[model samples]
Target chain A: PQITLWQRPLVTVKIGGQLREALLDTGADDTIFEDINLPGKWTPKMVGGIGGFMKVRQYDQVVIEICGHKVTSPVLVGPTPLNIIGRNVLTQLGCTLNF
Target chain B: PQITLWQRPLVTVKIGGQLREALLDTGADDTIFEDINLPGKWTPKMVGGIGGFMKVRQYDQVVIEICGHKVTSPVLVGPTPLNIIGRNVLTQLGCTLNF
Candidate 1:
């Protein structure tokens, strides 16, 4: 049996190549990184998002795997607070905290 | 002889580790990139801006060099369109358009 801890610790992760701190929020639904957060060497593409009702352009999406777990879903990049690991990210790890 | 064009053409460049695209603006006074853009390898720090009477925290600042000119200023990062090349950048390049 795996020991589960109910405490949620805030973790500081590097963005682009800069160090930034963030709270691992389980309330959010996706992984979000801001526009200025190091957008690695990648390609930009037009894609569809939530509600599937609109299309948007996104670029330089870096792959983030936390807690030794790799997320297999499309990462949603934003422009504030740097990055956030959400429900999809936690679900991918099959782990949960009793917040 | 070099010929100058009066029309401004938008150039798209990559950000972070992912290849996100941004429009290069020559009218801006300083280099600006959104929070979600390629922040690359950098550190976040809280500093004063503009009025010098307020404090702000910035993260993931990637060094941007354009047209053989590298800007040596603390970039103001935000979450928006992506990137802007303003006066702080263009003045360094000694470039001016008739328009």
Candidate 2:
């Protein structure tokens, strides 16, 4: 389905049997969640954003759903003000920027 | 025109007689530049992002061209890692988030 890019391009994301809302951030390199619950082991990683760098738990081969589109990719869980779904997931969903 | 949203969604932008590449940031509220040369009065404002808030010089009635589409809107200039073309300018160019 097509969606309009609002002032905040927020979208619903489903991961680890949980549903969450996240911003569709094309500028971000990785998908980052404010909080997440996933099984198995994860490695500590850091991501830089508009403000500064934050520590995150990087989990590989995580399956997530956005706009009804299911994708298995890497996800980063961290202390973010908001959940951001970046290009990794968006591209898998075949998202395009139309103007 | 339609463009694929890359990991960074970078685009060429012309502002204040200078050409620069910027990130198409759907998660940001306002468009921001690292530095710009404009002959006009501006106001001081603050914008919050992934980390925190930062002070910026808000220039109104500014014209910018992104992907050859010209848009006149308010632009914020501040010390930033990279230039971010936010929703305010994207919407004016009739951008859509299609997946």
Candidate 3:
């Protein structure tokens, strides 16, 4: 499916046994979810750019089905401003920007 | 041209009579350039969302040649974390997200 850029590119994502909506951010390098409890463990790390950094739990090998396309990548759980699906999963699903 | 998401989707843009690189951000609503000095008048405003709210100078009717595609939109100049080609110009060039 082709998504126009008139509004925020928000897509449905199935992750951690639940369905959630996340914004596809082309300029963002990492994917982060504000809330969602995964089954396994996670590693705590400090990350951020431009704004002040924050400590987040990095859950690797997380599988996410975005817009019917299933993909696997690392997902961060933290106090992020919003839920964003970044390049990590976008590249896996062969998502591209076309003009 | 089709741009993959493996790396940052940086594209060349001619704005403010200068060539600069900007990231194509689908999640961002307005286009913003941090350093370029655009000609003419501008209105002061605060840009919001995701990143911290920052005061910016909104320059209207700015013409930008993005990867050879000419587009006119409001470009903001201020303390942006990164230069981004947001939906304001992306939609003008029919930029879309394809899987």
* TM-score of the A chain in model 2: 0.92
Candidate 2: tens digits of C-alpha lDDT, residues A1-99: 666666587877789899898998877878888877788899999887666777889999998977878889889988889999888888898888887
Q: On TM-score, who's better, 2 or 3? A: 2
Candidate 1: DockQ?
A: 0.01
Best by TM-score: 2
Candidate 3 backbone clash number: 0
Candidate 2, TM-score vs. the true structure?
0.93
- For A1-99, candidate 3 gives per-residue lDDT tens digits of 899987889988899888888999998898988878887889997665444467888999998988878778889888777789999888888899998
The native-contact fraction of candidate 1 is: 0.00
Rank by TM-score (best first): 2, 3, 1
DockQ in order = 0.01, 0.72, 0.66
Task: Give one digit per residue, the lDDT tens place, for model 3 in B9-62.
Answer: 998899978989899998788899987899898999877654356788899999
- Candidate 2's residue-wise lDDT over B29-69, tens digit each? 78999867776899999877676668888999888987868
Q: Flag regions of model 1 displaced more than 4 Å.
A: A1-8, A14-20, A35-62, B1-99
Cα deviation at B9, candidate 1, in Å, is 48
Top lDDT: which candidate number?
3
